[PDB]
A = this chain, B = another copy of it.
Amino acid sequence: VNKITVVGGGELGIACTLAISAKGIADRLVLLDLSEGGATMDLEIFNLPNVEISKDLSASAHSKVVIFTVNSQSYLDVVQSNVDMFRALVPALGHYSQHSVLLVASQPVEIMTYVTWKLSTFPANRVIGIGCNLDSQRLQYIITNVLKAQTSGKEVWVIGEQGEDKVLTWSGQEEVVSHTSQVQLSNRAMELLRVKGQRSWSVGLSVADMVDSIVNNKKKVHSVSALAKGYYDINSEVFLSLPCILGTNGVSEVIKTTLKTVTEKLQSSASSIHSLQQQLKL
């Protein structure tokens, strides 16, 4: 039985909820509206099947996935304000669903994934962020369906810190792809992908797909924000987007890729995320 909890009744939270329902992914879906005693009741009013709206954290109990979509001026103070909000919520919600995967969609995603990790005390493999999953699934789609490289397109990933750049790396789980093909396929795909955004509806579709893989234990590879210590010579406790196999029990495997110098982009993001994290009050 696949119970899923979406945390936060803003646009993002409704987008996740509608996306999940549209595909019939959840047996029960609880949407937590944390607003002062709004329009979130429309989902019940219009009787979205198996959608329960609640203000009660305990309604989340026994979820397979809990999706954090809440968001709350200088950058540090904006992050800390979101941190303050997570402190009131994560510990409770971790306790209601101790066997769940926590999936963090709130921004800035790497930092908020770390925060959720620390507040919940869950093992790292069960605390992930949306990372570059949306970027990755779009890139692969373009290459497989638009450029018609049906196998090559499954082997390219967007990784690292979301929104900062588009760092590309290639896995090799199905075929060797020569460098000349890697370059043409990704330049052509980037033409189509450079201009696309991160609007709530897009993110909610991305989240629904990850949730589908987790609850149905698909063991499908997703570029998600995952604890990056021990990868790319990162030794700090920072989350970066990495190709991970997802199932019921979270990340079962981080996929190996081949990468040059470019790990410098990753290490600079890690260093910058870590410095900021050390300035936060949990």
Contacts and interface: CB of A to CB of B under 8 A. Distances in A.
A85 interface: no
A35 B11 CA distance: 22
A272 interface: yes
B23 A49 contact: yes
Contact of A271 (B14, B23, B278): B278
Nearest to A276: B272
A164 B48 contact: no
B42 A202 contact: yes
Given A39-B197, A164-B74, A196-B38, A18 B269 contact: no
Interface string A199-226: 1111011101100000000000000000
Interface residues of A, number: 62
B199 A11 contact: yes
Interface stretch (A91-99, A115-123, A133-141): A133-141
A166 B205 CA distance: 34
A107 B278 CA distance: 22
Interface in A161-181: 161-166
A141 B22 contact: no
Contacts of A197: 38-39, 73
A218 to B, nearest CB: 14
A200 B276 CA distance: 26
- This protein's copies in its complex: 4
Interface string A39-52: 10111111111000
Given A23-B46, A138-B45, A76 B165 contact: yes
A263 interface: no
Interface in A1-51: 11, 14-15, 17-19, 21-23, 38-39, 41-49
Given A22-B18, A272-B271, A164 B196 contact: no
A198 B78 CA distance: 14
A208 B46 contact: yes
Nearest to A192: B41
11 contacts: A22-B46, A23-B46, A41-B196, A43-B205, A74-B107, A75-B163, A76-B164, A268-B272, A268-B278, A272-B272, A275-B275
Given A39-B199, A165-B279, A268-B276, 12 more contacts: A18-B19, A18-B22, A21-B22, A23-B47, A41-B138, A42-B138, A48-B205, A75-B163, A76-B272, A77-B165, A269-B279, A274-B275
Those 5 A-B pairs whose CB atoms lie nearest each other, nearest first: A268-B275, A74-B163, A21-B22, A46-B205, A272-B275
